[model samples]
Target: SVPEAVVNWLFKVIQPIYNDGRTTFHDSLALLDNFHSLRPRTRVFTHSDGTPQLLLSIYGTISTGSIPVIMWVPSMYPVKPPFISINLENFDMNTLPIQEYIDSNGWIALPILHCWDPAAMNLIMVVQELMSLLHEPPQD
Candidate 1:
């Protein structure tokens, strides 16, 4: 079970994705609900054109350990896809194969640039896949 603080924070971050047919983000939002340690931080970031946007920063861990990430949901949502990535400022992990997909802004650009399928993908799946890519420690 998630601690009270984390659960409340998740609801605050999740309530926005329940936009009827406006988004496919609903898939990932519910996945987070099952997690117990996740926390959300909201902040504004300036874009290349100097436009400021509010992004949700999620700090948490999956099976691998600390898996910090950030997300920027676009208006088109299900038709488009959010910009989400590992938070290197908080921690580092393996970034092979998909490293080419990370943009200059440090956000994974695949969902925006290519290969996004609302019928098949969501944030939680990506997060889980990334966790599987992390290098494991050698057990003695």
Candidate 2:
């Protein structure tokens, strides 16, 4: 068994990273990058003929469905705690930039704001980023 002091010290040391929010641009992107490479065989909708030109997501690891985005804010603290915004302040910079990067190829980036419950906020931001890839408006 470990000593109480060691446990206390470990908790103190790791608390900061945990409180800082585990979600990061690089981290989320890495997940997305893997999803892209997966290229799962999914049947989305049809373009004109019934040839089937679209696909769906296999895993919930990344958001890529018609379902709207849902941001889940959890109660990190036992009591009232602070909040964290994963997306950068400027959409054009953080979200938009990444959206453009993929949509330019053929993906869509749908923005879904979900705050139904505070318990799922962090996951919501993740959903937003993932869904962003499935929401493609227009190139022009």
Candidate 3:
């Protein structure tokens, strides 16, 4: 228990450096930084808005294939959510509960729009939700 106390104390000491205040645009970059670490297979690039556009490949057991998706980073990011699109050319049309939810442009309607809190939304949470859409196999 003594070392456990030291470990808990270290979390308090080291965590703040990772938390730069929320509204800054750099927070968007921080998200991309963390995202790159989490999904090394993901690709990133910049757009006219200056924030990075994250390209991720989603896989689901049922689809039997993967789909490449992309996000359009808002200039007001961290204050607004990115619009995501599954690449129509590459996406498997049968992956979701409702395939029709994806439009001709490959944009799928997502629940994040209803529960979104710009200040609280980070890349990790965003990707986590997207991963859920991937439909991984259930554990015993």
Top lDDT model: 1
On residues 51-87, what C-alpha lDDT tens digit does candidate 2 reach at each position? 5432222233333553321122222421222222222
- Model 2 misplaced regions, further than 4 Å: 1-14, 20-98, 101-110, 113-117, 128-132, 136-140
Per-prediction backbone clash count: 0, 17, 0
Residue 90 lDDT in candidate 2: 31
> Ten residues in a row with the worst lDDT in model 1?
17-26
Q: Estimate candidate 3's alpha-carbon lDDT, on a 0 to 1 scale.
A: 0.45
| Whole-model lDDT per candidate | 0.55, 0.33, 0.45
User: Lowest-lDDT window of 10 residues in candidate 3?
Assistant: 56-65
**Which pairs in model 3 have colliding backbones?**
none
Candidate 1: Cα lDDT at 32: 59
How many clashes in candidate 2? 17
| Predicted candidate 1 versus true structure: per-residue lDDT over 33-122, tens digit per residue | 655455556677677899986555555655554445565555455566666776566334534444564667677554323667867776
TM-scores, all candidates, are 0.57, 0.22, 0.45
